[PDB]
Amino acid sequence: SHITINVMTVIDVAAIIDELKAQEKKLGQTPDTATSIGHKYIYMSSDDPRGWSVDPGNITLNAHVGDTLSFFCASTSDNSEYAAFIYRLTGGDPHLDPSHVEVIKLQNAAQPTPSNGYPFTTAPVAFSSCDAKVAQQGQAKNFYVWAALFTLDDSGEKQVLAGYVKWDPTVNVA
Amino acid sequence: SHITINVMTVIDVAAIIDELKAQEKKLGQTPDTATSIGHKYIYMSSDDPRGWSVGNDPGNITLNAHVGDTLSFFCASTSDNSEYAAFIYRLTGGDPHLDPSHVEVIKLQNAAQPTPSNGYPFTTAPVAFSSCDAKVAQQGQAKNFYVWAALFTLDDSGEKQVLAGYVKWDPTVNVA
Numbered sequence A: 001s002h003i004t005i006n007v008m009t010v011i012d013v014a015a016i017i018d019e020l021k022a023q024e025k026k027l028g029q030t031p032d033t034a035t036s037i038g039h040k041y042i043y044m045s046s047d048d049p050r051g052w053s054v055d056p057g058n059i060t061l062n063a064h065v066g067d068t069l070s071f072f073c074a075s076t077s078d079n080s081e082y083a084a085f086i087y088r089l090t091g092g093d094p095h096l097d098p099s100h101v102e103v104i105k106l107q108n109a110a111q112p113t114p115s116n117g118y119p120f121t122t123a124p125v126a127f128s129s130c131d132a133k134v135a136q137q138g139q140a141k142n143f144y145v146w147a148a149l150f151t152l153d154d155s156g157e158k159q160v161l162a163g164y165v166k167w168d169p170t171v172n173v174a
Numbered sequence B: 001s002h003i004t005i006n007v008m009t010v011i012d013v014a015a016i017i018d019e020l021k022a023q024e025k026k027l028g029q030t031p032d033t034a035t036s037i038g039h040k041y042i043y044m045s046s047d048d049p050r051g052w053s054v055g056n057d058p059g060n061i062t063l064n065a066h067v068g069d070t071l072s073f074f075c076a077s078t079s080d081n082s083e084y085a086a087f088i089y090r091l092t093g094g095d096p097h098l099d100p101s102h103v104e105v106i107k108l109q110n111a112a113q114p115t116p117s118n119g120y121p122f123t124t125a126p127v128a129f130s131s132c133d134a135k136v137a138q139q140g141q142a143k144n145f146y147v148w149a150a151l152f153t154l155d156d157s158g159e160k161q162v163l164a165g166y167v168k169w170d171p172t173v174n175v176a
């Protein structure tokens, strides 16, 4: 029958921001004017039980038409310094059909406690993912993942919006 | 010229738990009794400014680092800890290549958070993170180095995550 496949993207948020600095380009400041970036700093993995394999910006998934791809992301610090959140997927036609972002709030998500991690506790945490339906096997040509990027301010306690990016990962469905 | 290098591990928590029970192996229920697992379901990335490459095999990574550099290890499930979840709480071994420190639990008063139902406008709220360091003591490939994590599942109510158990794996880390 039909399954959901997690596609997790680790993002080098620092590299992307510092790249743009040196590249004389600037970061988009509205969700619609997200800066289009390479897939140089985009590292995908999956839980695909049907099997899968991965260069950066690329992934090959065994998926049937009717399967759902569920896109998750995080910075290389697991959003504890720089942070990234996906809010949108567009395109993919005819291979993928994006849905709208799904915000999950676990009222009791597992959380580490100081100063040893264990014993672990629970507390409210919010997460985001965005799904895409597999509509046709092949390499999706025109598929964009959109994410908001954040940095840690000098207080070391608050993360602030740095801007919006989008990238065009190469997703092969097989 | 010393720098901190992030090592992010994505973990297929489901596959690790399934294969363990399909293999008759108990899942460790105490932090000190974590079950040694293969590194088949371990996928590492980095932010290493000096460059890096990711193993044709999972459980491998090659990082450009110098002695005195610090590796900081982070992790999450394939669903970003929103269904199954994972948290590093310990690193052991590594002699003479890596020298682990003890776990650090980061609490951000105002971590960035998505809001329903559009994600944006984002908000902020308290969230906890864990990571653990190892100092680069000698270039080469660490053989005796273990990352330890607590694994969690999402119960039937879909609102609470519960402790499944503890595991440790021995990633192949090449410092070059």
Ligand SMILES: [Ca+2]
Binding pocket: A104, A105, A106, A107, B158, B159
């Ligand atoms: Ca909920």
Ligand SMILES: [Ca+2]
Binding pocket: A115, A116, B102, B103
């Ligand atoms: Ca401690």
Ligand SMILES: [Ca+2]
Binding pocket: A074, A078, A079, B076, B080, B081
């Ligand atoms: Ca995370």
Ligand SMILES: [Ca+2]
Binding pocket: B099, B100, B101
């Ligand atoms: Ca030590």
Ligand SMILES: [Ca+2]
Binding pocket: A156, A157, B106, B107, B108, B109
């Ligand atoms: Ca703090």
Ligand SMILES: [Ca+2]
Binding pocket: A100, A101, B117, B118
């Ligand atoms: Ca919506």
Ligand SMILES: [Cl-]
Binding pocket: A089, A090, A091, A098
């Ligand atoms: Cl669209």
Ligand SMILES: [Cl-]
Binding pocket: B091, B092, B093, B100
């Ligand atoms: Cl040790």
